[PDB]
């Protein structure tokens, strides 16, 4: 009938911010968002 905004798909990747675990545990979030209509 019309453009239906289907719920977007998230893609989370959480990584450690360190080449070897030296220091405070800092975590890096990487996001890939895909929006869908119909």
């Amino acid at each position: 009938r019309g453009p239906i905004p289907l719920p977007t798909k998230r893609l989370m990747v959480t990584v450690r911010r360190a080449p070897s675990g030296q220091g405070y545990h800092t975590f890096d979030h990487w996001e890939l968002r895909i929006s869908k209509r119909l």
Binding site: L11, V13, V15, R16, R17, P19, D28, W30
Partner: peptide, 29 residues
């Protein structure tokens, strides 16, 4: 193992992403 460099340490099998968890931060975008 990985994609851009064979490391095998932080293999990553999320979805279909094969990266070493340190290559991913440099290539993430």
């Amino acid at each position: 193992r990985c994609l851009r460099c064979g490391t095998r340490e932080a293999v990553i099998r999320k979805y279909g992403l094969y990266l070493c968890r340190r290559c991913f931060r440099e290539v993430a975008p």
